[PDB]
Ligand binder design. Sequence first.
Ligand SMILES: *CC(=O)NCC1CCN(S(=O)(=O)c2ccc(I)cc2)CC1
Ligand SMILES: *CC(=O)NCC1CCN(S(=O)(=O)c2ccc(I)cc2)CC1
Ligand SMILES: [Cl-]
Ligand SMILES: [Cl-]
Ligand SMILES: [Mg+2]
Ligand SMILES: [Mg+2]
Ligand SMILES: [Mg+2]
Ligand SMILES: [Mg+2]
Ligand SMILES: [Mg+2]
Ligand SMILES: [Mg+2]
Lengths: 233, 227, 12, 12
Amino acid sequence: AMGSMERASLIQKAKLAEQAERYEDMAAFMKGAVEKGEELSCEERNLLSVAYKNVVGGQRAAWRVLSSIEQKSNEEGSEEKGPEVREYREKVETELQGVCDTVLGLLDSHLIKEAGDAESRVFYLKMKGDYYRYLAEVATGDDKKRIIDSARSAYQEAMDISKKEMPPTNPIRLGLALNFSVFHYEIANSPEEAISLAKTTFDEAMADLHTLSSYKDSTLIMQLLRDNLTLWT
Amino acid sequence: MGSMERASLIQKAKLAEQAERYEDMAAFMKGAVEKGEELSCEERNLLSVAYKNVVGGQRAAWRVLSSIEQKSNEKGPEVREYREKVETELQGVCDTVLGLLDSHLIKGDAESRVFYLKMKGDYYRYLAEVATGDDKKRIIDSARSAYQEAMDISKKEMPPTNPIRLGLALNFSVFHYEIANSPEEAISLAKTTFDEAMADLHTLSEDSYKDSTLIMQLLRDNLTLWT
Amino acid sequence: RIRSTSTPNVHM
Amino acid sequence: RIRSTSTPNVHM
Ligand SMILES: *CC(=O)NCC1CCN(S(=O)(=O)c2ccc(I)cc2)CC1
Ligand SMILES: *CC(=O)NCC1CCN(S(=O)(=O)c2ccc(I)cc2)CC1
Ligand SMILES: [Cl-]
Ligand SMILES: [Cl-]
Ligand SMILES: [Mg+2]
Ligand SMILES: [Mg+2]
Ligand SMILES: [Mg+2]
Ligand SMILES: [Mg+2]
Ligand SMILES: [Mg+2]
Ligand SMILES: [Mg+2]
């Protein structure tokens, strides 16, 4: 029952949970803090992001292992194998979907509308895109099409704001473009758009690199753009 | 879990292990234990690996929080509250394991009897690490009693270089050093164990060689640390 | 196949 | 102080 807890206590406990590598707890504390209805600071956005991405990251890795085993089993086509792995893959999938739905709920109910400045609005729209993308990875059929569209729409709105309001070297803008390029390549079957976006992003960032203090962060993301471009070409 | 067939529970424990989902793995193995059949050696490995991953994470977290708590005391109620939360969860897992050992597993061959008594010792030891006061005394006694019964069986029924016997002796030596404030006994046990194991190493089967040498190296390393 | 790399989960 | 090492959590 976090409703009656001091916001400052929830934030403190999120930081403790992080130090203890207790990421489910950390995420629950940050959900509690979000639900207070105040805007988040930079540090708090980092805590929220790190917590939920550790949780969903573990689920994604596990789902991938199980899906691979499932498909290998099915391809062999033995009369007696397969039901257990399918059931357990389904269990992990359901848990992953639940966490994604929680994050998307927080974004919709509290964070996106309540953001004052462009920087934080872009961060939250990027996050909405990312969690729809994680849902898309495990979706099938017509649900998958709808989910892909939702991710695209969130990313595009973020891109539109970031181009009007933020420098090309800003790490939020860079991370958004990186992730949208991954969406294009891995989810939306659009390698041409992936490559075009990544190349444009990298070049425009490199052009203003001389202006930064900032530097380490921006160059890290630019290197990942470069690595993907090498992978894709 | 009890609506799944035993074979399905075992299969799902193996899948959970591959996926690094150790809480799930432990729950599957608890379900398999509750079917009431003995566990094979492979199945004891699954049970052991699963619960030790879970409690291992809890222990690491507790140690971090306890350190912060003590440093702070050396800024508010939060660290104490959260340390207590993690502590309660750890105690819960230890109680679950000890419950399974008492209700189902401890009864067969020497290897399995020694393994389960060692496990009882270990999980009482993990409870001792977080205990205070009179409860701590009782818990320490329970760990000692389990370890000693295991040691007695292993000396009568197993060769000195057997890896189960070795792992038991290693853990009992850790109990002495870290829990029972008995460095002399810790060192004496580890040294005796190492020497007696090396003396019979030529009789050990090749399938146990990598395991027994690993444990003997840890005995050596602790002895270096302690002296 | 090697998956594309997305933004890392680190404090910025 | 370095803590003593116990039996590792590996398949035997
Ligand atoms: C001031 C502020 O809002 N800080 C919060 C961080 C902004 C950037 N995001 S991110 O997910 O876009 C990201 C970018 C670059 C790197 I290196 C890591 C993460 C995290 C919260
Ligand atoms: C045959 C059998 O019972 N195998 C299951 C293992 C027995 C030993 N334990 S243990 O925790 O005592 C252990 C000893 C040595 C090593 I290397 C690792 C663990 C694990 C189950
Ligand atoms: Cl399942
Ligand atoms: Cl708490
Ligand atoms: Mg076959
Ligand atoms: Mg599904
Ligand atoms: Mg049955
Ligand atoms: Mg079957
Ligand atoms: Mg039966
Ligand atoms: Mg307590």
